[PDB]
Symmetry: C3
Subunit: 474 residues, 3 copies
C-alpha cells in the first residue's frame, strides 16, 4: 500500500480569498507591520531637533523661551510638540510663514551668525530700550534673540542705511520685522518720525513697508503689531535695509546647508538613544515589510502606509488535520507518501515558486521615502482640501491595491498546491499501469509485494512495471 497526501501542522493562521474566508493554512507570512518602539530615534546617527514648547516661528525668530534651541547646528528631522505655543511673543502676522516651514523642511543644517553686531552696526540709534512686556523672560521684559528693536537716540531717529554681502557661500536666511504703533504719540516716542517707511531691497527681492496706526484689540496686552518678514540671500548678493523708523533690525542670520529626507512632524513621543531607518510620530519602525498601518507620516525609508486591518498571504497548504486529509505526522515536507515519507524534489520546486511570488510582491511595492504634512493659512483652505484629496486619494488606491492582490494571490497559491499534489499522484498512476489497484482516496493497493527498496524506486521515478507484472493475481 502506497498513499499520497499533503502536510498538516498545529497552525492557527487564517487567510482570506475571493471565494472563501478564514481559511486555515499551514504556513503564512504577514505583510503588514503594526509594531513600533514608541520612541523618537536617531536617524542616520544624527539626533533630531526637538522644539519643545516652541513652534517654527519662535525657534528662528529667537523667542526667549526657545533659547535652548539657539545652540543647535545639525539635525536629521524636526519634531514639534502638540502644545508648541511659544512663537511671536509680540502679536502680529508672520508673512509667508507656511512657505518658510517648507523651506526649512529641506534644510539639514544651518550656521547661526551675527549678521549685524548690535554695538557696531548702529551707532546713531538706541540699541537698548528694545524690550517689550509681551516678550517677558524670567520676570523681566526681554526681546527676540535674533532681532534688535531700534528706537530713537537722543530724541532723533536718523535715516538708516545698512547693507550686507553674503560671503558665506550658502543661502542666508534673513529675518526682520516692521512695527505698527497703536497711537501717533507712541510712534514719535519710539521713532520720532510720524510718517516713516521701511525698505528692504536685494537683487531678487524688493519690498517697502509703511507702518499703520490704528486702534487695535490687545493681544498679550499689546495694541501694537509686528509683522515678520524673511528672504533668502543667494551667495554674492547684497541686501540693503533703508528705514526711517519702525524697523526691527536683523541681529542674527542663518547660513543654510540643504539636505534631503528631512521634515517637520508633530509627535508626542519622547526622544531615546536609539537608531532607526524609519520614524513615525507614534514611534520608530525597524521592518522590511512592504506595508505598515502605524502612521501615514514617515521619515526615511519606510513601508507604504495602508488602512488595511490585516494583510496575510498564503505560503503553505490548507490545514486539514482531519486525498481527503493532511498528515500531521509528515513533518519533512509539504508533499509525500505514506507506507510516511516526503518527496523533497516536488516540494523544493513549490518552495522556489512561492518564494519568487513573495519577492515579486515586495518588488512591486516600492519603499516610501520621507512624506511630511504641509501647513496652510486661513485663506488657503482650497489648497488644504486639494492636498487632503491627493493624500486620501493615493491612500484609497493603495489600500485597494494591497488588499485585492493578497486575495487574488491567496486563491492562486491554494490552486498551485492542489494542482501539484494531483500531478504527483498522477505521476505514480502513470508508473503503475494495473500493478496497483486505484483505491481513489490517494492510496494504491499493490497486487505484488513491495519492499522498502521497491518503494524507493517509485519515489525516485525509476519504477519498472515489467519487474512486478509477473505477480498478476485474481
Amino acid at each position: 500500500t502506497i498513499c499520497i497526501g499533503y502536510h498538516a501542522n498545529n497552525s492557527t493562521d487564517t487567510v482570506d480569498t475571493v471565494l472563501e474566508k478564514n481559511v486555515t493554512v499551514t504556513h503564512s507570512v504577514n505583510l503588514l507591520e503594526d509594531s513600533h518602539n514608541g520612541k523618537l530615534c536617531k536617524l542616520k546617527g544624527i539626533a533630531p531637533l526637538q522644539l519643545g514648547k516652541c513652534n517654527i516661528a519662535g525657534w528662528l525668530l529667537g523667542n526667549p523661551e526657545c533659547e535652548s534651541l539657539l545652540s543647535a547646528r545639525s539635525w536629521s528631522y524636526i519634531v514639534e510638540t502638540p502644545n508648541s505655543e511659544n512663537g511671536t511673543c509680540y502679536p502680529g502676522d508672520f508673512i509667508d510663514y507656511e512657505e518658510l516651514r517648507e523651506q526649512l523642511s529641506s534644510v539639514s543644517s544651518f550656521e547661526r551668525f551675527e549678521i549685524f553686531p548690535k554695538e557696531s552696526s548702529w551707532p546713531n540709534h538706541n540699541t537698548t530700550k528694545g524690550v517689550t512686556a509681551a516678550c517677558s523672560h524670567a520676570g523681566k521684559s526681554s526681546f527676540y534673540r535674533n532681532l534688535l528693536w531700534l528706537t530713537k537716540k537722543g530724541g532723533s531717529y536718523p535715516k538708516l542705511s545698512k547693507s550686507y554681502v553674503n560671503n558665506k557661500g550658502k543661502e542666508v536666511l534673513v529675518l526682520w520685522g516692521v512695527h505698527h504703533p497703536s497711537t501717533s504719540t507712541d510712534q514719535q516716542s519710539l521713532y520720532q518720525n510720524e510718517n516713516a517707511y521701511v525698505s528692504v531691497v536685494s537683487s531678487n527681492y524688493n519690498r517697502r513697508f509703511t507702518p499703520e496706526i490704528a486702534e487695535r484689540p490687545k493681544v498679550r496686552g499689546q495694541a501694537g503689531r509686528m509683522n515678520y518678514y524673511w528672504t533668502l540671500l543667494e551667495p554674492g548678493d547684497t541686501i540693503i535695509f533703508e528705514a526711517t523708523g519702525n524697523l526691527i533690525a536683523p541681529w542674527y542670520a542663518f547660513a543654510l546647508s540643504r539636505g534631503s529626507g528631512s521634515g517637520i512632524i508633530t509627535s508626542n513621543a519622547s526622544m531615546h538613544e536609539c537608531n532607526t531607518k524609519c520614524q513615525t510620530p507614534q514611534g520608530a519602525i525597524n521592518s522590511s515589510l512592504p506595508f505598515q498601518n502605524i502612521h501615514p507620516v514617515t521619515i526615511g525609508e519606510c513601508p507604504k502606509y495602508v488602512r488595511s486591518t490585516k494583510l496575510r498571504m498564503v505560503t503553505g497548504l490548507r490545514n486539514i488535520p482531519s486525498i481527503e486529509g493532511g498528515w500531521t505526522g509528515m513533518i519533512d515536507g509539504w508533499y509525500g507518501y505514506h507506507h510516511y515519507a516526503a518527496d523533497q524534489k516536488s516540494t523544493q520546486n513549490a518552495i522556489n515558486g512561492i518564494t519568487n511570488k513573495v519577492n515579486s510582491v515586495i518588488e512591486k511595492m516600492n519603499t516610501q521615502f520621507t512624506a511630511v504634512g504641509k501647513e496652510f493659512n486661513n485663506l488657503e483652505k482650497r489648497m488644504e482640501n486639494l492636498n487632503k484629496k491627493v493624500d486620501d486619494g493615493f491612500l484609497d488606491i493603495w489600500t485597494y491595491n494591497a488588499e485585492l492582490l493578497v486575495l487574488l494571490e491567496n486563491e492562486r497559491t491554494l490552486d498551485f498546491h492542489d494542482s501539484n499534489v494531483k500531478n504527483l499522484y498522477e505521476k505514480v498512476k502513470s508508473q503503475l499501469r494495473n500493478n496497483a489497484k486505484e483505491i481513489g482516496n490517494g492510496c494504491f493497493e499493490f497486487y505484488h509485494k513491495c519492499d522498502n527498496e521497491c518503494m524507493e524506486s517509485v519515489k525516485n521515478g525509476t519504477y519498472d512495471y515489467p519487474k512486478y507484472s509477473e505477480e498478476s493475481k485474481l
Copy 2:
C-alpha cells in the same frame, strides 16, 4: 441500456459579459455593478432640505442682494444648489476679494445664524444712514442697496472719525462682511464723504488691513463708474473686531454665526426640488442604489457609488448559456449541476444540491468581496478659481481626471479577470462532478466520454440515488455483467 448523463443548467437569458479571451459571452446569470438610473429631482438629504439660491449667486446671498431677499430667512440646509442662470451677486461693480475661498468655507458650513451685528439706528448716530442707494442695485423700480450692508455717507456736511467695535458673544465663528467704495471723481468723493484723503481700517486679533480709496477714470459697469471692493473675515469666539474709518466705508449691517458640519457642498443643477428623501444626490438627480459604481455624475453629496466612465459593468454569477458535455440542459431548472435519469421506472432531470450549494457560496462571496473593496464615495465638491489661478485650476483637474482614469480602469479590469475566472471555475466543478461519478462507478458502468455513462448493469431508483448521494455500493451491482 440504462444511462446517466452529467450536464449544467441553461435558461433563456440574453445577458452578455466580457472576458480577456472572448467578448459577448452569453451567460445564465449575471449581476450589474453599474448604476445608471436617477430620479432626476433634487431630493432632501437626511430629511434636510437643500438651500437653493435660484436666480442668486453666493455673493448676492451673503451680501444681501435685493433680489435675494427670499434667502435671508434661511438658517439650515443639507447642501447648496446654484442655478446656471444665477447672475445676481455684486450688483455694484467691484472686486470680491477671496470670493472663491469664501465659497470653500461655506461648503463646510451646515447652518448659520443671521444677526444684526451693528443695529442700523443705534450703532451710527453721527452718520447718514438714509442716503445709501445706488442705481445699479435697484429694487422695485427704486434705487436700493444690500440688505446686510449699510452705506455710510456724509451727514450734515461732516464725516466725523468712525470707530466701531464688536465682541463675539455668539460662541461661534462670525462671518463679517464689509465693503470699501472707490469714487470716480474727487468731487464725487467730497460730495459723499467730507474728507478727501480717507482711509478704512479693519483690525481684529488675527486680521489687520488698511484700505485706501483710489480715484480714477473707469468704464461704466451697470451704469456706475465707481467700484466697491467687498471683503470678509471670520471672527473667533470672544474676539473683538474694530472698524476705524474716515469715509468710503460700507458698514456691516448683518453678520452670520457659523455652525460647521460635514458632507455639505455647492453644486450646480437644473433640477427642481421635490418632496423626496435620498442618501445620494447628484446635479442630474438623486440616487437610491446599493451598487458600488455609478456613471451618472462625478459630483456627489452624501453616501454615493463611485463615479466611473464605464458604459457597462456586468459580473458573471452563473454558467455559460449554450443550448445543445456538448451543451446545457434547458429542462433542468433545479440547480446549476445535475444528472439525467433513465432507469425505465422514472426518467428525470435532477440537480446535485451539494455541488450547487457550494458553488453558490463561492460566487456570493466573490461578489460581496468586490463590493466591500469598493468604498462608498462620499461628498465630492467642485472648486472655483479666479483668472489668476489657472495653474491651480489645472492641477485640480489632473487630480480629478487622474483618479477617475485609475478607478475606471480598476473597475473594468477587475470585472474582466473575475468573469474569466468564474467561467473557468464552473468548468472545473463540472469536471470534478464527472470524475466523482466515475470513481464510484469504477467498473460497473461504461464511459461514453460525452458526459454520459452507459450502465452495463441495471440501476434502479435506489441505485441511481446512491450514486447521486455518493453512497453507491459497487459490490452490490458488480456481479451483474
Copy 3:
C-alpha cells in the same frame, strides 16, 4: 511499430518574459508593450511648426527683448520649445508679476496676431517717446529698449497727466503688457519724470490696479540701481482698458490678439528641429508608435503612450521555448503551436492541428488588444513653473506626478505578470486536451508510452493517421488484440 506523438512548437527565440512564479522564462512568441525608440528630432505637429525661442525665454519673447527680434514675426505654432540657456528676458532688472501664470495661459494659446495697440508717434503728443533707451537693453552696441514697450519720459521738463484708452476691436482676448519704472534716487525720478510723487493706474472692466513707484537705494543689477516691474492682463472682446499715469509708466507699444487652441504647451528640449510630422512629440524626440506605454519622457505633446518607469513590458503570445508530457519542443513543426508527430511505414513528419491552434491565436490576439484598449492614450502633458514663494505648490504638483506615475507603473507591470502566468497555463491546458482527444479515440488499439506519444498495436497508414488528427478515427476498423 507505428507511432503518433503530441507536442508543442519551438523556434530560435531568445525573448524572455517574467511571471509571478518564475522569472526569465524564454518564450516562442511575445509582444512588446513598451516603446523606447524615438526619432530624436523636434517634429511638426499637424503640419504646423513649433515656435523655437532659442536663447530667449517667455518673458523676453513677449516683452520684445532686442535679442528676440526673430520671434516678433510669429503668428502661429503647435508648441513652444525652450533651450536650456534661454537667458534673455527682462533686460532691465525687475519682477515679472504673475509670470508663471502667464506661461499657463500661453499653453492654451495656438496663435496670436501682433498689432500696434498704441502707435509710438501718434498716441502720446505731450510726452517724449525717444529718451527711452537703457544700457541693460543694448542692441548692436547702442542702448535700446523693448520692441513691444515704450518708455515715456517728460517732454520739455514737463510730464502732464496721461489718459489713454483702448477698445478691443479684435473679437479676441488681447494680451496687454506694460511696466512701471522705479528710480533709485529722487533726483533721477525728477530727471525722467518732473513730478516727484507720481501714480500709475490701469483699469478695465475685469482688472483694476494702481501702482505707486518706490524710490530707494538698490544694488546694481546689469549696472542699474532702478527697477522695472512688468505687468500683464487679458482684455476680453469689446472691453475698454484705460491707462492713467502721472509718470513712471512704461507704455504698451504692441499687443497681441490671442486665438486659443488645445493641446499646446511649453517644453524644454535640446533637440533640433527637422522637417518631419508626428502625432507625438517629447523633449527627447518624436514618437511614431501604437504601443500603450513608453519610457522616453513624461512630457508629451499630442497623442502619446502613457509614460511609465518600467524597464521592459513584454507579454507572452506563444509557448515556452524548450528545444531538445513531452521532453522538449519540436522545431520542425512550423505550422502551428499545437500539432502531432507520426512515424509510419511511409515516412515521418510534423503536422499541426489548425483548429486548436487558431482558437488559441484568436484568444491571445483578443487578450493583447483588450490590454491595449484599457491603457488610454496620454494627451498633452506639460510641466508647470513656480516662483520662490510657491514651493508648496511645486511640491504638491510633484506629488501628483510621482504618485500617479507610481500607480500606472505598478498597474502596467502587475497586469503583464498576471497575464503571462495565465497565458502559459492556458497553453498547457490546450496541449493536455489535445493529448486526451487522441487518447480517447485510441481506446485500446494503442499503448500509452507516457512521453506524449502513442504506440500503435496495428498498422496505421497515412490516411488512418489523418483520421486520428481529424477526430474521425474508427476503433472497430482496427479492433485487434495484438498481444
